[PDB]
Amino acid sequence: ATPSQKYNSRSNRGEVVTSFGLAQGVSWSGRGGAGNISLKVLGCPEALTGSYKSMFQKLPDIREVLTCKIEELGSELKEHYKIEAFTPLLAPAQEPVTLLGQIGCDSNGKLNNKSVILEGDREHSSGAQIPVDLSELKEYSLFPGQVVIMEGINTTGRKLVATKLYEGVPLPFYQPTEEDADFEQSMVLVACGPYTTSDSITYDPLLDLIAVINHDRPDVCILFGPFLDAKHEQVENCLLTSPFEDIFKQCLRTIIEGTRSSGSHLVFVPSLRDVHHEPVYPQPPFSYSDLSREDKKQVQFVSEPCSLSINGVIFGLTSTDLLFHLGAEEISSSSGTSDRFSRILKHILTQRSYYPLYPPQEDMAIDYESFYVYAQLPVTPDVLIIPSELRYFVKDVLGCVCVNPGRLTKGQVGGTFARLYLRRPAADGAERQSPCIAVQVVRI
Amino acid sequence: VSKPKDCIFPYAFKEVIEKKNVKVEVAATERTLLGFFLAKVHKIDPDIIVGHNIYGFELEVLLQRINVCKAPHWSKIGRLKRSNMPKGERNATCGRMICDVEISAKELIRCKSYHLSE
C-alpha cells in the first residue's frame, strides 16, 4: 500500500556526499560509447568463466592451500627484508628469532591483544601453534589469518615475545604499455545493490540509476549484486509469485534495455546475496542468453571478485563486504589518531588476496580450492572498488584509489553510487601518476 | 651455585654449609660459576657428557650465558682450543661426546612423555 514511500520523497537527490582528485562541476559526462573502449578481463587464468568444477572439498587440500598462502608470501617477504632464515615456532632459543606464520585466534570469539597466536607454516614448523606476547610491541596491526613475519624472543618455545612486526609488502602496480597512454578520457560509473527498498519490490532506485546512467552517458557501468537480495524480506519468506530465476532476468532486462541509447558498456558483478546464483565465493559470472547481437557488444559478465582492465586501467572488483569483515576482527596499538579503514585496506593490498581474512565471516562460504587460483590480486590495483555497508569514501592508499560507493540503497532510504574519471598521463617522471584522476560519491 | 643480581645469598650460608660437609662451592657472579664449571671440565676432562634435554635447551643456554658474561675460555667445554664461538652446537663440544638421555630414551623405550620427570 505504501512501498518506497520514503525513498521517493527524498530531497537529497543528486547530492554529492564526497569528492576526490580535482574538483569537478556537476556536469559529469563521458562520450557515451564513442571512441575506443578496451574492456579486458584480467588476473590468473582468465578469472573463471564456467559455473565451477565442483562443490566438494578435500581437507587434505585446504590444508595444502593455507600453507602455500603463508609460504609464498613468506618466500617473498624473506627476499624483500632479506632475512636469513625463519626459526621453527617450536624451537626454543635465547637469541632473537624471526618466525613465519599466520595469526589466528585461540578461541571462537573476537581476536584480542591477549589471545593472539601464530600458526607457523608446514615447511618449517610443521604447523605448530605458539601464542604471542605483544606487551613489548609498539606499532602493530593484526587480523586473523594475517600472514606475518615476526621477530621476538621465544626461549621456552612456548611463547614468543614479539619485538618487531614486519610491515606488509604489496605487489608492483601494472606496467603501462605505450598503447595504454594513447587512450582518451573515460568515465566509469559504479554501483552495487540492494537495488530496491527493503519494504517494496519496486526497484525504484534501479530505475533512477538507469535514468542517471542515460543522462550522464557513462563509458562503463559496473554493477554489483545483489540484484535479487537473498535477504530482502519478501524473498526470504518466499511470498513472491514469481520464480527467482525470472525475477532476476527481469531486472537484467530493464537495465540492459533501459540503457540501450546510452552506449555504455555494462559489466555485472554477482553477489553471494543474489538468491538465484551459486552461493560460493569465488562466484562464476552470471548466466543469461537473452541478448541481441547488439547488446552482446554492450554487456559483459564477470566473476566475483575480479581484476578488470578499463583502458589499461586495472580495477579491482569484489562484491563481498571484505571491509566490514576484516574490520570487525582487527587489533591495533593505536586508537588516538589512525585511519581504521586506511589500515584494513592497507593489509588488503599487501595480503595479495580478495579475502585474506581466514577463517571467513560466519555467513560466507568459500571454496579454497578455487580461491587459490581465482581470488589473488595480479598487481596492486590502480583502483579498488570495495562496496560495503560502511559509509561512503575514497582514500588513496599505497598508490591505489580505494573506493567504496556505499550501497545504492539502504533499508528504507536513499543510497549512493559513484563515478570516476580516468586517463593515464605522460610516461616519465616520479613513476606513480595515478591514472584515476578524480572521483565522486553521489546520492541518488 | 651463584645468585641473580637482585638477590643476596642468605646469611651464614657459607658457614651453614661448612657444617653439613657438602662440596658446594659458592660463586658470586654467574660469570664466576660459569668459569668454575669451564674449569672443572678442563681437568676432569670428560670424554662423554650425559645430561637431559641437552641438545634441546641446556647446551645452548650455557654456551650463551657464557658468551654473555664473557667467561674465560668457553673452548674448555671443548677439547680443541678455539677463538670464536658459532651460534654451531654439535661443533661446540668437539672431542667430547654428548649423551642426551632424552633422545636415547625415546629411541630406546616407549613412554607417555620424555620430560625428565616421566
Strand A147-153, strand A160-165: pairing: antiparallel
Residue A216 CB partners (closer than 8 Å, separation 6+)? A28, A29, A30, A187, A189, A419
CB atoms within 10 A of CB B14: 10
d(CA A370, CA A304) in angstroms, rounded, equals: 12
Burial of B8 (0-12, 13-18, 19+ CB in 10 A): exposed
CA distances to A183, A189, A293, A396 from A310, rounded to whole Å, are 10, 12, 22, 19
The number of residues making up chain B comes to 118
Three-state DSSP class for residue B93 = coil
DSSP class of residue A219?
A: S
CB atoms within 10 A of CB A187: 22
CB atoms B56 and A95 under 8 Å: no
Phi, psi of A304 (to 5 degrees): -165, 115
| Chain A partners within 8 Å of B61 (Cβ) | 94
Phi, psi of A212 (to 5 degrees): -60, -40
Q: For residue A359, give the C-alpha cell.
A: 577463517
Burial of B73 (0-12, 13-18, 19+ CB in 10 A): middle
Closest chain B C-alpha to A68 CA, distance in angstroms: 29
For A351-385, the DSSP string reads: H-BS---SS--SS--B-HHHHHHHSB-SSB-SEEE
d(CA A42, CA A52) in angstroms, rounded, equals: 18
- Using alpha carbons, select from A185, A182, A154, A146 the residue that is nearest to residue A34: A185
CB atoms A94 and B57 under 8 Å: no
Q: What is the number of CB-based contacts under 8 A between chain A and chain B?
A: 9
For A378-424, the DSSP string reads: SSB-SEEE---SS--EEEEETTEEEEE---SEETTEE-EEEEEEE--
| A91 alpha carbon, distance to own chain's centre | 38
Asked if residue A330 lies in contact with residue A74, where contact means CB atoms within 8 angstroms, the answer is: no
d(CA A328, CA A110) in angstroms, rounded, equals: 8
Closest chain A C-alpha to B41 CA, distance in angstroms: 23
Cα dihedral A15, A18, A20, A26 in deg (nearest 10): 10
Which of A84, A87, A90, A94 is the best residue to mutate to test the B interface, defined by the most B CB atoms within 10 Å of its own CB?
Answer: A94
Any idea what the Cα angle at residue A224 is, between residues A221 and A230, rounded to 5°? 150
| Chain B partners within 8 Å of A84 (Cβ) | none
Closest chain A C-alpha to B5 CA, distance in angstroms: 19
Residue A270 CB partners (closer than 8 Å, separation 6+)? A225, A277, A283, A284, A285, A286, A303, A304, A319
Helix or strand (DSSP H, E) at A316: strand A314-317
| Chain A partners within 8 Å of B64 (Cβ) | 94-95
Task: Tell me whether A90 touches chain B (CB under 8 Å).
Answer: no
Task: Tell me whether A93 touches chain B (CB under 8 Å).
Answer: yes
Asked if residue A322 lies in contact with residue A390, where contact means CB atoms within 8 angstroms, the answer is: no
d(CA A173, CA A313) in angstroms, rounded, equals: 10
d(CA A92, CA A69) in angstroms, rounded, equals: 25
Resolution of the experimental model in angstroms, please? 3.6
Q: For residue A90, give the C-alpha cell.
A: 617450536
User: Directed axis angle between helix B30-44 and helix B59-68, to 10°?
Assistant: 120
Task: Tell me whether A290 touches chain B (CB under 8 Å).
Answer: no
CB atoms B61 and A95 under 8 Å: no
d(CA A373, CA A43) in angstroms, rounded, equals: 9
| Chain B partners within 8 Å of A94 (Cβ) | 60-61, 64-65
Asked if residue A309 lies in contact with residue A326, where contact means CB atoms within 8 angstroms, the answer is: no
CB atoms within 10 A of CB A192: 25
- Using alpha carbons, select from A100, A91, A104 the residue that is nearest to residue A71: A100
Helix or strand (DSSP H, E) at A188: strand A186-192
d(CA A109, CA A331) in angstroms, rounded, equals: 13
d(CA A349, CA A323) in angstroms, rounded, equals: 12
Asked if residue A161 lies in contact with residue A153, where contact means CB atoms within 8 angstroms, the answer is: yes
Q: Provide the sign of the torsion angle of the four alpha carbons A220, A225, A227, A232, taken in this order.
A: negative
Three-state DSSP class for residue A254 = helix
CB atoms A94 and B60 under 8 Å: yes
Residue with cell 564456467: A50
d(CA A169, CA A171) in angstroms, rounded, equals: 7
Residue B37 CB partners (closer than 8 Å, separation 6+)? none
The number of residues making up chain A comes to 444
CB atoms A94 and B56 under 8 Å: no
| A6 alpha carbon, distance to own chain's centre | 31
d(CA A102, CA A366) in angstroms, rounded, equals: 19
Closest chain A C-alpha to B27 CA, distance in angstroms: 23
Interface of B with A (CB under 8 A): 56-57, 60-61, 64-65, 87
DSSP class of residue A4?
A: T
Helix or strand (DSSP H, E) at A129: strand A129-133
d(CA A167, CA A309) in angstroms, rounded, equals: 29
Question: What are A162's strand-pairing partners?
Answer: A152
Per-residue burial over A433-443, b if 16 or more Cβ lie within 10 Å, else e, is: ebbbbbbbbbb
Helix or strand (DSSP H, E) at A161: strand A160-165
For A16-28, the DSSP string reads: EEEEESS---S--
| Chain A partners within 8 Å of B66 (Cβ) | none
Three-state DSSP class for residue A189 = strand
CB atoms A92 and B64 under 8 Å: no
Estimate the share of chain B in helix, then strand, then coil, as percent rounded to the nearest 5.
40, 5, 55
* One-letter amino acid of A115: S
CB atoms within 10 A of CB A34: 11
CB atoms A94 and B87 under 8 Å: no
Q: For residue A340, give the C-alpha cell.
A: 581504521
Q: For residue A58, give the C-alpha cell.
A: 578435500
